[PDB]
Every structure is written in structure tokens, then in C-alpha cells.
Amino acid sequence: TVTHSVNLLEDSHNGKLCLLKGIAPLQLGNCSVAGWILGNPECELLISRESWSYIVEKPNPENGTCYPGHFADYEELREQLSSVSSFERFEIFPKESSWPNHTTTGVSASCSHNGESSFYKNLLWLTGKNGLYPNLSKSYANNKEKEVLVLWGVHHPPNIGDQRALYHTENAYVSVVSSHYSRKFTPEIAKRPKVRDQEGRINYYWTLLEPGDTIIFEANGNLIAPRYAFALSRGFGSGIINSNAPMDECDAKCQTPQGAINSSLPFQNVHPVTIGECPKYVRSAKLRMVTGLRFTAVGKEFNKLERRMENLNKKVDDGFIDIWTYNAELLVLLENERTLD
Amino acid sequence: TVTHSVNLLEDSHNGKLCLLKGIAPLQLGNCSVAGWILGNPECELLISRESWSYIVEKPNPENGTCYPGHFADYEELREQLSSVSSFERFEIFPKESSWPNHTTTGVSASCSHNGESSFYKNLLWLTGKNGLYPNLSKSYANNKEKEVLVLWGVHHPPNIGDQRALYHTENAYVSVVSSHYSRKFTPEIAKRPKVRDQEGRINYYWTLLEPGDTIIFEANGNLIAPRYAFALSRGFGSGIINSNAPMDECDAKCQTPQGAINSSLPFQNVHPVTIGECPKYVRSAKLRMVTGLRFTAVGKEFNKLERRMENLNKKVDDGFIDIWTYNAELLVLLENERTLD
Amino acid sequence: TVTHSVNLLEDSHNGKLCLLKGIAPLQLGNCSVAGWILGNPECELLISRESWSYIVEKPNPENGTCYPGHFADYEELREQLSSVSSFERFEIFPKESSWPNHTTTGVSASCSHNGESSFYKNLLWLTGKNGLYPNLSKSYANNKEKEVLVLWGVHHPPNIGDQRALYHTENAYVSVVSSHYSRKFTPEIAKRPKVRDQEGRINYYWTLLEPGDTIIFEANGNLIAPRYAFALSRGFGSGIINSNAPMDECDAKCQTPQGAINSSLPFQNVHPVTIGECPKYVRSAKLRMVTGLRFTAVGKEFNKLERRMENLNKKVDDGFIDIWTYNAELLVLLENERTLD
Numbered sequence A, B, C: 001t002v003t004h005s006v007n008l009l010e011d012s013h014n015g016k017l018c019l020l021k022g023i024a025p026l027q028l029g030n031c032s033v034a035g036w037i038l039g040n041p042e043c044e045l046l047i048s049r050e051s052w053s054y055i056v057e058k059p060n061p062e063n064g065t066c067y068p069g070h071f072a073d074y075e076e077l078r079e080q081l082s083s084v085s086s087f088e089r090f091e092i093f094p095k096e097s098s099w100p101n102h103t104t105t106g107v108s109a110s111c112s113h114n115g116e117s118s119f120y121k122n123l124l125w126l127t128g129k130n131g132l133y134p135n136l137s138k139s140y141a142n143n144k145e146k147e148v149l150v151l152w153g154v155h156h157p158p159n160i161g162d163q164r165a166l167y168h169t170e171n172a173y174v175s176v177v178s179s180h181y182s183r184k185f186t187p188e189i190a191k192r193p194k195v196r197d198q199e200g201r202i203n204y205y206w207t208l209l210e211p212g213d214t215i216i217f218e219a220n221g222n223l224i225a226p227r228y229a230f231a232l233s234r235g236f237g238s239g240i241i242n243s244n245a246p247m248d249e250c251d252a253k254c255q256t257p258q259g260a261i262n263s264s265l266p267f268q269n270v271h272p273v274t275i276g277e278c279p280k281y282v283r284s285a286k287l288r289m290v291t292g293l294r295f296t297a298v299g300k301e302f303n304k305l306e307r308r309m310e311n312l313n314k315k316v317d318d319g320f321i322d323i324w325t326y327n328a329e330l331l332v333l334l335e336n337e338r339t340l341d
């Protein structure tokens, strides 16, 4: 365009999910956030990962909720976990001593691992023993000085005989309480479409038990209790990135779902979603300054019933993306009009 | 302002709801979206309209929900239907063969047509027969390769005798299930203010059964079952316009609630809501460029309990409307300062 | 920077919560909005205040909900009350004649006043009498020509014996109905963490009964009925300000949580939240124009389960704050580049 000029825009991503500042992300792989937290057997991240720089999820992961059901506030949980830099996966309710008189080792084929029927690892499918499902009243007091992510579930069996078998009551209930949180779940029994060869459901629920707060579970049946929980360490700059790009042990300053960015420029256009010390996104292509003469992630953050939000958010993000872009162009269009003197 | 100048702003709307690209809108008239979908008798659009370019609703339509009650996620449904370019109204559950042993032809005065008591046309008010309301288990499998909008309802009668009469049970339930969607409704019996001379209620519910998914209804009473559903064809550019302006068989490129726009200009100010190839809205009035010398609809998108959203959305839309406007003015204010050379 | 210049930015707040246009705010003090509306005894604003220019709340007020429980749509109520310029606190259900055969004067230590156990003042804790809790069916018809804010509550006692004592039924219910509003509450009985030395809960509910609409309460127990309600007078410019700054009987044109603003300038940076005829916020510090040569409140508007909203709103507000700021700077940066001629 002119003899001397400087480009400000970076359009080249290394096409890989590098390290960030020398810390490594968490690759869920086939697994989704729901399976990871719940401990879907196919994930194997449980024992091995507790820290990262960012989380990596694939566009359409299939290994999430193995036993069909509704994961309440799934997207709110995603937004919670975006800011989690690390955590501690601890056995809030030890399987061995917490449930002496309840048949742990409830298992389903819908969650099979290596061919054998199994179940989530961070949860527990309680069932009666010796013909009893005695009322349970287990409690946990968050004394870890970090907010504790607790998971649990309620089994909505397909028929009354199944419930009578698992729990030996027709009219069971699940009560979960804390200092603020109070809720009661009754199982809904009904035949349903046979997802993953299973005709029942499990409703998955969660809450962030704050330090000092005490959470109580009461139940005469239908509880998928927690075996492990998570003590969360919040962190800025981290976040969740949806992508299927490969990784090497490259290190970078910025990261984006298509690839990392390792360049001094202020701007870029590969993708607005970004993590770390990164250039700022624009839609443009031609940011040249003459020197001579002649944010949050997106995509799965909202569910069916929230399409307003998405639209609104689509209206907002996209708006700003345009807005600043224009200004940026204008700024150079001004500056070139000036620095041509 | 100067000898030579070009105006960029269009402030003249033809005051009519023309055709768009030669396709005709859907004029609900007195009827609202709720009555249209539910099939409020006063609408008469059912047999006759299945396609359009945009939907037209009046500010305060009175012919919507004839039998009083809460239409769940009404606004979410509006946002769903904004993107519907057309659909197919089909008899998911034929009245004649789907309910052989249940008294169809339940009717109320609150939905009267031509003086005779009647009922919604896209719904069915089941009632017992021969002293029985046998449990029903009807199912539908979406094999139409398009997402299917299903409607239904639950009758909350004013008193226990009314329920015992209609359904011959005091403790009825309604279970609606799909691959994800699972829900259970119990009728709430109570005397209430006598809206449209009716002391009971009907809670209206809906869902988008995706292709291949199977929806099951179970009930021992209190079901207002569907007679017709809708297979949706999504479409960009379409949308919902709230207005009372008249129509002629004029054709236009753009449309707005006050009137259409047929002009080459890039900008305008008649209304931000617009459909089709349209000039872009601003608040301004004086966009002149010298050549010489000296989005989504709005208004009813949110309910009572969501006034944050509206405020937020009001904060956003109005913001951008201002923002760009300024820039536009600035752009000309700059350009005139330049093109005066 | 240059010999002649004018500053446009105001960075000095008087550090006090003055009057606005000569009208005085409402200082809740220790009390929060919830306690104020509910009538937490420690507030004493009830008899004495019904009008203001704005509301003042402290960052972490401790005197709100005295009897533990969930205040439904608390934040939506805050947003409702932001636009309330005044109201009329009237005894919708007179304690003396509305509940002849129900033991008013239910009291708890969790709401103690001056050492004596007491209870909210705008609510009523009904309890049985002479061994009966006869079904009640009290009603109110809004004939005040202003929307009426109604409050009520449901006692979820810690154990079945407590409920049997207060209400002499194990399976109570609370039905609240209006022309649109219909709802039913069943008490959930469970031992819980002993907040404010209380092991039960009260779920607080509200609604805006519009003029002409009739609200009906039905109950066989567990009702914390209303004693007073509020007829609301909407008003622009008013709002809610969260702060702990002191007050004098100073008068001002604008107000902000850190302090008032009394200055002619168009801009400022002390705080974006503002009330009244105020300069417009920016982040900047150096707005000088040469003449020579060389919105809504924020912070508590959303709850736990809504962190998307907050993020979104944080994304929006902060965005605009930046955006306009830039433009403003640009505008002067342009103008100085021009007015230096």
C-alpha cells in the first residue's frame, strides 16, 4: 500500500494446544465436563490431574453422562469450572466407612468400562442391604477453607418394581440441606425412551458448599450419593476451550481453540476466545500503520430453554467484536491519514 | 448546510405491512402467538397458513389463551418461532383413533366461537368415558426429520368435585417424557379469581421433540392432550414484528413495525427493529455527506420475573443504538471535515 | 500540556450521601432490603419512611432475613424496588380482625428485638388456636389503583412434631392464587444446620398484585401470612446504592456510592453508578480540551446460580464503560488536534 508499513494483526495460529506459561492444560478427550466431574470411567483423569492452565473439550464429546438424566445447572457448573485453576478430589464420604449398612457397588451397563458394567467413580449408587434401606443422615462440614463442589444424584427408575428392588420403598425421597441450600426430590417413576439401553434416569445435582457450611443428606431411597467431591481453587486467566486440535509439548503465551499464538502483535483475528497474554481480537484483515511515504468462551454456555441468553450474548459479543474492530480500523485509518505527513 | 450534499438517512416509512421479497407475512390480528399455536378458535389461520416472511402481532392482542392459565416459557417459545419461516401442522394424535376410550369433545365457554362453547383446535381436552378415565400411554416418534413443536396442557380445576367429574380421580398426575425431557405435573385444586368466567386454570407446556426422539404422555387425568403439532422449518431474516399497521399488497425489501422501507440509503431512523435487506438504524436526523464547497425484536420478549433481562437488554440494544449512531455521526463529521478540501 | 486548556473530568466526590434535589434517601443501615420489606425489627424505618430519592444499603448488611430461609426472587425484588420512588405500607390483613381464630403472636428468638424474642413486623406467623388450625381462605382485592407488593412465607419446620404443634397437621399446604399467579407450597420437614440458633426455615415469597386483581391465600398450616403490604409508586432516576458512606444534610444534584457530585462538568470517574443529573462516567484521567496554543446499579443484582448473568452484565457494563471512554478520549484527541490550529 506504501513503501514503509507495519502490520498489527496476527492471522497465524500454530494449530496446536500448547502449554501456557509452561503449565499444561487438561485434555478431557472424548469425555465432557459432566463425565469428568461425575467421574465417567472412560476419563481416567481423576487420579492423575488436579491442576492446569485451561480446560480442553471437544465440540461433541460423547463420553459424558453415562446413565441418562438431566444434569441440573450444567452450564452454570461449566461457568464455575472455567475459573477453577486447580482442585483437590477428596473422598468426602468414604465408600468403606460412610455406608456400612447400605449396598454400595450398584452398577449399570450404561456406564460400562472395558466391557464390564461399572459406574461413575466420583459418585456412589447406594442400594439396600439385607432387605433394608435404612434412613441415612450423613453430613459433611466444609473445614477445608475452600468452597467444596458437591455432586449427587437421584434415581428415577423406570418402574415401581425396580424402585422397590433397589430401595424397598414405593414413596421415597431425597433431602439435601445446607445453611442456605435446601431441597427435596421425589423420584418420578415412568417408562421412558431407552437411552443407552436404559429406561430410567438419574437427575444430577450439585452445589458449592462454602467453608464452615454443613451439608446434610437424608434419604429413604433413590440417592446416588457422592464418593468424591472437589475443593476449588479459583483462578483468573484460566477458562474452558472447546476444540479438537492436537497438542505437542510446545509452550506459548496465548492460546485459542484453533491454535496458540506466539507473536508480539497487539491484535489478531484467528479467534476471539483466547487465554493468556494474547493479542486482542478483531474481524479485520488489513491493519497496516505507515511509517514513511508513497471476555468469555462461548458455544455451549446455554441450554435449550435459554436461547434468549445465547441470542443476547451473541448480540453482545458479536457487537463488541464489530465495534472495537471498527474503532481499530478507524484508529489506523486516522493515523495513516496523519502519519502520512 | 453546503451547496452539494448527499443524505444517507431515510426517515419515511410507507406506513404499511407490505410483502417481503414477494412473500406474505402472517397477520394474527386479534390473536396472539399463544392463541395461534394453541389454536384459539378466533384465529382461523390454522388450515390456511403455514409459511410467511415474518409474523405480525398487535401490541395488546386479546385473543390468546382463552382458558386461563400459565403458558410456560411463553417468551422462549416466541423466540423459537421468530426463526420459523414455515411449518407443517399435522395431527400427531388423531382425535378419532388416538383416544378411542376417552371422551374427547371437552369444551368450555371461555373459548367460545360464534356463540357456541368450543375449545382450542390444536389441543384436546380429554375426559373420562362410561365412568372411566383409563390410564393412557400414547407415544409419538419424531420421524419427520424436522424438530417437532409439541403442545399440551394440564387442567387445574377449581374444586375436587370438578376433577372427580372430568377424570374420576382425586390424585391424578401427568407425566411427559422424552430422551431428555422428563417432567411430572400434579394438578393443584383451588378456587381462584374468575377470569373469563372460569375459576380453574390450564397450565400450557411445550417442547421441541427432535428428530428420532420419542415423546410419551402418561396420565390418569387432567391432561389437555395435543391434537396437532408443528414441524418447524428454521429461517434467517424472518422474525416477529409487533404492530397494528395496515397492509396492502405492496412489496418491499425491508419492513418495520411502523412501515416498510423502499430506498437505497444505508441508514434510517424510523425503527431499529427491521426485517430484510434494510438500512441500518440510528437515532440521528442529519446525516449529510458533502460533495462540493460552501438484531432482534423487543417489547414482549420477557415476563414479570425477568425484568433484569429486559433492563439488561434495554441497556444493551439502546447502548449499541447510541454507540454506532455516534460513530456514524463522527464518521460523517470526520468525512465532511475532510471532503471539504 | 499547553498554555490554555479546560478540564472536563470530575474526580472529587464530597464523600457523603447528600440529599438529592432536596429530597432525602432511605438509610437502611445495618438492615438490608429483605429485612426492610419483611420488617426486620432492627430497622425501625417502617412507621417513619415511605418516600425518598434513592435507597442506601451497606455492602454486607447483617440485619436482613432474621429467620433463616430463601427469599425467592430476592434480586428481582431489588430491581423492582430500585424504581420505587415511594409507597404506602398498609395493613392488607389486619392482625386483629383478619385472623380471629388463629393464634397470631407467633415469635422466635432468631428475630429478637431489645432482647425479647419477636418477629417480622410486615409479616404474621399464624399458628393454631384451641387445638385447631382451621382452613383459612382470606382474600384481598387490589383496589388501590397501584400495584401492590405482597409478601408471605412458608415455614419449613425442623421436625414433624414442631409442625404438628404449630399447625396440628402433618401434611399441610399453602396455596396462593391470583388472576395469573398460582402456586402451591408443601412444607419440607428436615433437620438442618442451626443458623441463628434455628433449625427450621422460612421460604419467603412475593408478588405484585396488579390493580383490580384478587389474591387468595389458602392454607391448613405453615403460613407466614402478611400483615402489611406495599402499594408502589414507580419513579425514574431513583435507584439503589450500595455503600457505607456517611450523610450530612447536604444537598446535591448527583450522587454516587463514594460520594456526591456538585460540579458543572460533563464527565467524571469516581464511580459509574450514579443518581440524578450527573456527569457521565469514564475510566480516564486526563480530559483536557485546548483553547489556545503552546445505567443501573451493580454488585448484588444476581445470586449464586446466575453467575452467567453477572459475567454477562460485567462483560456489558465494563464494555460500554471502556467503549465510550475511548471515544471520549478520541473525541478530545481529535479536537485538540484540530483546535490547536
Ligand SMILES: *[C@@H]1O[C@H](CO)[C@@H](O[C@@H]2O[C@H](CO)[C@@H](O)[C@H](O)[C@H]2NC(C)=O)[C@H](O)[C@H]1NC(C)=O
Pocket (backbone or CB within 6 Å): A030, A040, A041, A042, A062, A063, A064, A065, A066, A110, A111, A112, A196
Ligand atoms: C463412551 O463413548 C463411546 C464412544 O465414543 C461409547 O462406546 C460405543 O461407541 C460406539 C461408536 O464407537 C457406539 O456405536 C456405541 O453405541 C457405544 N456404546 C454404546 C453402549 O452405545 C461408550 O458407550 C461411551 N461410554 C461412556 C461411559 O461414556
Ligand SMILES: *[C@@H]1O[C@H](CO)[C@@H](O[C@@H]2O[C@H](CO)[C@@H](O)[C@H](O)[C@H]2NC(C)=O)[C@H](O)[C@H]1NC(C)=O
Pocket (backbone or CB within 6 Å): B030, B040, B041, B042, B062, B063, B064, B065, B066, B110, B111, B112, B196
Ligand atoms: C376474543 O376477543 C374478543 C374481544 O376482542 C372477546 O369477546 C368479547 O369482547 C368484548 C369486547 O369487544 C369483551 O367486553 C368481552 O368480555 C369479550 N368476551 C368475553 C366472554 O369476555 C372473546 O371473548 C375472545 N375470545 C377468545 C377465545 O380469545
Ligand SMILES: *[C@@H]1O[C@H](CO)[C@@H](O[C@@H]2O[C@H](CO)[C@@H](O)[C@H](O)[C@H]2NC(C)=O)[C@H](O)[C@H]1NC(C)=O
Pocket (backbone or CB within 6 Å): C030, C040, C041, C042, C062, C063, C064, C065, C066, C110, C111, C112, C196
Ligand atoms: C442484627 O444484627 C446484629 C448484629 O449487627 C445481631 O446481633 C448480634 O451481633 C453480634 C455482633 O455484634 C453477633 O456476634 C451475634 O451473633 C448477633 N446475634 C445473634 C443472635 O447471633 C442480631 O442478631 C441481628 N438481628 C436481626 C433480627 O437481624
Ligand SMILES: *[C@@H]1O[C@H](CO)[C@@H](O)[C@H](O)[C@H]1NC(C)=O
Pocket (backbone or CB within 6 Å): A029, A030
Ligand atoms: C475415544 O477414546 C478412545 C480412547 O482414547 C479413542 O481410541 C477414540 O478415538 C476416541 N473417540 C474418537 C471418536 O476419536
Ligand SMILES: *[C@@H]1O[C@H](CO)[C@@H](O)[C@H](O)[C@H]1NC(C)=O
Pocket (backbone or CB within 6 Å): A100, A101
Ligand atoms: C450396621 O448394621 C450392623 C448389623 O449388625 C450393626 O451392628 C451396626 O450397628 C450398624 N451400623 C450403622 C452405622 O448403622
Ligand SMILES: *[C@@H]1O[C@H](CO)[C@@H](O)[C@H](O)[C@H]1NC(C)=O
Pocket (backbone or CB within 6 Å): B029, B030
Ligand atoms: C377482533 O376481530 C374481529 C374480527 O376480525 C374484528 O371485527 C375486531 O375489530 C377485532 N378487534 C378489534 C379491537 O379491532
Ligand SMILES: *[C@@H]1O[C@H](CO)[C@@H](O)[C@H](O)[C@H]1NC(C)=O
Pocket (backbone or CB within 6 Å): B100, B101
Ligand atoms: C376401548 O374400549 C372398548 C370397549 O369395548 C374395547 O373393546 C377396546 O379394546 C378398547 N380399546 C382401547 C384401545 O383401549
Ligand SMILES: *[C@@H]1O[C@H](CO)[C@@H](O)[C@H](O)[C@H]1NC(C)=O
Pocket (backbone or CB within 6 Å): C029, C030
Ligand atoms: C448496627 O446498628 C446499631 C444501631 O444503630 C449500631 O450501634 C451498630 O454500629 C450497627 N452495626 C455496625 C457494625 O455498625
Ligand SMILES: *[C@@H]1O[C@H](CO)[C@@H](O)[C@H](O)[C@H]1NC(C)=O
Pocket (backbone or CB within 6 Å): C100, C101
Ligand atoms: C371464630 O371462632 C368463634 C368461636 O366461638 C366463632 O364463634 C366464630 O364464628 C369464628 N369466626 C370465624 C371468622 O371463624
